[PDB]
């Protein structure tokens, strides 16, 4: 509900607080189908133009449903395939003899209807598209008896516009090897998809849940190629279950932390690692180091927690106390003091060093602050662009509140002669240890 | 004008010259208007082929106008909204109550107009397709009154064709949350790009940039959904303005520079580090470390500075002298000798190290050089490709002059024994204050 | 054939055999020609619906001719342009002076033909689509003669489906500045590809091979946009040669490998590099680092030689021996102890450190096995998923046989107070001489 956020002098890092949880925990598979008619051969000896476009739009629908027969001779076996073996564990059952026949019977007088497979799984099954009623009952009659009956023209637009869906499925289970994601409205609707939601075994808050965030669902979604066999087109698509909801969630932002000395060369440098999303989840912390692995819509994140890292809740001690023995807080250090900035969620954090201008303005009054060498902070209430050096970044315009935090720079508590720069992974005791053996070899003279 | 390249030997690195620059400082924000006509019931009991057609294509509008709702419902908050705040401003303006009557009516009479909001920003907006002026002149008859009149065949294929483009639009706003980049055609056509180029408050010879390089254009451009509201679907086009304009940039290349001893094991290498594209920028230099932010097309290199970092323009002295005192060259250490190439804009880098085959060959005439042991450079005059190991370059065949610095390899002014081998983003000053600590160690001894 | 892994419990890392190779080293180009027909005025004053529909259409050709011509304009020089300078240097060809007019000939009677062109290429080309037919055929008396004739509705149909490929060209060469990849069916459709196959000068067990797997094929593939000049439209499409076949290829999966002390911070860690995929390749073993750069169907690998690295065949000994002096086997080290997984091919390596709950389960059993501190693994025969904190990971259920290579972890023959941790490229000689250096300083005392 409420965002706000806290910047750490002594640290360089701002955390922005108030975000709630939807994290992925499990998958729920479901089966679309599209009722092909296996129709081969067209004897045609009339050259009738309304026929002609019949027949083109017909061979069509063959290369269409050939295509689809040598993309599931190739089955691919491309990353871990840990993220679609739930679905891809339901195209190994429609695969066995019977089972295409057992959805092709409960979709015979509705379009959708619950199934339960050989293998346990209570899949829900769909008729999206009913192309063997339309083309043996609309179009058989012109291609058979050895001459075509004239069709009218608005059977060859009302079959431009069915068989259309079956194409566009067919060209993005080309291009991306029977797995597509996001999800499109080709793959499903959004009726469909809501329909779905509706149709889920699962809670009325998780419903309204996933209907208010339908884009989100889609690009968190797969549709699995899996069998064309007996007048049956089968894809299943896997939809997320978020089974971590409402739980406090909060973005690290770090930005390097440098001394300000005046001859250049002197000068060391301190960064926090681990920037990113952190989200409470039973009893620890799910991290989210990777930045296009979380969505945000309106205070909610939506994460994926196949992209996490388990962390005790600990890790948090980081924010209020980074010398605290708990958790060892983890740093990189270096003499690289060029300047920078960070966009955090209410703000911005800006690290200046050497000869950069570094500034924030209003737009209407001009430069509001000029940032000094260092590590600094600004809140987006009454600014609205930072430059640093030749670039000129927004500052976010939402709402919510911001705490500066103030604190000596924790890079001025180390004597620069035997600082260990140049660590990459580090933790603070890891650099106090080099820093205890740097002493004893001068402890001796 | 005239692309130039200089290959030194001694730091293993090669400077491609002779480029001038367009870098990204601004936005330009338009509004992009298509008035819609809010129908709603169509009583029908006429089951006339055409009737059918006109009221599926009429849901296919509908359900597009439902899904544009829903997804103004939800607004994203990803990445740091940085670089779409200028038009997400311009959305939380189209937001309050009167202001899409005002560009309601300035688009009365015309399809382009600018117009001045309520916060100082005079916007260029476009009808770019008017769906209420077809659906309630040509379509209302046919679905009031209680029973359907018959539209004629060329109206139903009239109408799949102008409401084809909102299908599209809010195709590619579901999939991507309101925000695509780059902006498709139907986004904005070529046609209305290039007026809307025309239209802009730049001089004359930005327009003629810009409209040369429409495709780089459109990948630097971002288009927003604001809002679908009162019979008017509004979305923010960003376009970008190239504040930098012809000034030289250059293209660093690097590769790793190791000794070549026969013991393996003995020998140490370095890299020169912060490849890529460096421009000049109001007295310092914008470097671009990323490889897909900068796109070149005929000697013009188009960046954004967002993602650039400013450097001195001493920054450069590291290609002709890289012990100079004015500017802390960077490299990187390691012992890692394995074979690789690097093609350059008029040449090929060439590493060789071990048993490695290093050659370059000329179509016709086969191996024409064959590089020993360490890093050497050839011009494309005269060779096609480049093989390394199993590998075979394609050398670029662009028109310009190549110039062998010679000079001697640094690697070998450092004494193995007290080389600081491993060490990443470091300095030339940080490896020599290594070395001479290394050196008081066998000093006192 | 027969899939087959192997875990070094020593080392925490796993190698998966019995991959079969298709490495590509060379390009097929081939030219795809649209004929158009450059029609300019139509004066028509008939307001006629089915004269008006085919203007519109008409303008729809007109606008995408004009944006291929100001696509062609602007030649793009982005990436190194080194996997593309085989078709690039085709299109040099095709901009010579009486070139186009020879494929113009070729083409006058067939749709495919051989052509050899001024520079000794022999390209296969050919016309996929006649526009210049079609549109003078039946659209010029329609649009000539001061006044318009009236097409039937079957032509205004007819030249919507066949004007749409070239629209949709255009559309997917504007966005992408002439270079797409992979190769959609509209700029090949999976007919025309397979005849291409067909066409090609090689072996009957490589048509078989890249028929099978034209999806793979897209994906390797670039179409290259040349020049529309003289009522042609011409593009480039590369194909690849793949040299190396039926080599043996392998994945080798890595985990971090630490001590499992009680007391935290007193513990060392070490994990393997160079992950990934490996084939042989004469006489030498290519390395490919990057995860995205080979597809996997059916137990054979596509890979691109571009994105590899020329190993010596030693580099397998990495695998039976670590401590090997014929290969330098690269580790990295640190005192990182979070736990996580790798999903192998035939099940799964644990990295469980810390407090962390590790776990196998089967779908219908429960847990049945718990992970203790240290490295382990699990095949997945009877095991379904595997925990790791608050993630859960599906292991690939894929027919094969595992074995546990068991032997001491190597992270224990390390003396924790002199081990060189936050090393990252290092091998496993140059940890072994910085503990030599680190053993000198405490011999002396
Ligand atoms: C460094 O030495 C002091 C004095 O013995 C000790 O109290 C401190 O805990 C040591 N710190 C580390 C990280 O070893
Ligand atoms: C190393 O020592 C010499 C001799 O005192 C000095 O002249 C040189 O500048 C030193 N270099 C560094 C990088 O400390
Ligand atoms: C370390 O020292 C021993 C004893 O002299 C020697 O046998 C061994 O090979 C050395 N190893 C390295 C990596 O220097």
Redesign the interface.
Known sequence: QNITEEFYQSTCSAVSKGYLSA?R?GWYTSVITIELSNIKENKCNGTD??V??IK?ELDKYK?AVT?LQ??M??????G????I??G??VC?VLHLEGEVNKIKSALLSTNKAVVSLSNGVSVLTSKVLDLKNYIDKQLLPIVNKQSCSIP???????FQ?KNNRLLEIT?EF??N?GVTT?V??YML???ELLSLINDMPITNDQKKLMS?????V??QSYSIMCIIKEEVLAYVVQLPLYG?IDTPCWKLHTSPLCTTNTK??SNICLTRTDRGWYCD??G?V?FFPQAETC?????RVFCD??N?????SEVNLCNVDIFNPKY?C?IMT???D???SV??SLGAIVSCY???KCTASNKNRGIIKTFSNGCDYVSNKGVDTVS???????????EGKSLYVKGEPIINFYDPLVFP???????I??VNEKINQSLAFIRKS
Do not use: H, W
Request: no cysteine; net charge positive; aromatic share 2%.
């Open positions: 994290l925990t133009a309304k002609k476009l083109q290369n295509d040598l993309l001779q190739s089955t691919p076996a491309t871990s395939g840990s993220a073996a739930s891809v564990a190994k009218n023209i608005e059977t060859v637009i009302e516009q060209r080309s291009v090897a996001p499109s409205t609707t959004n009726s208010n965030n339908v884009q989100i889609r690009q971590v250049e060369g989840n039973a620890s799910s969505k945000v819509q309106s205070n927690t196949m996490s890292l388990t962390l005790p060892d983890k270096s003499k690289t060029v300047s920078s966009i955090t050497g000869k950069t640093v050096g030749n670039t000129l970044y927004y500052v976010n315009k939402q720069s140049l660590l990459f992974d580090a933790s005791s890891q």
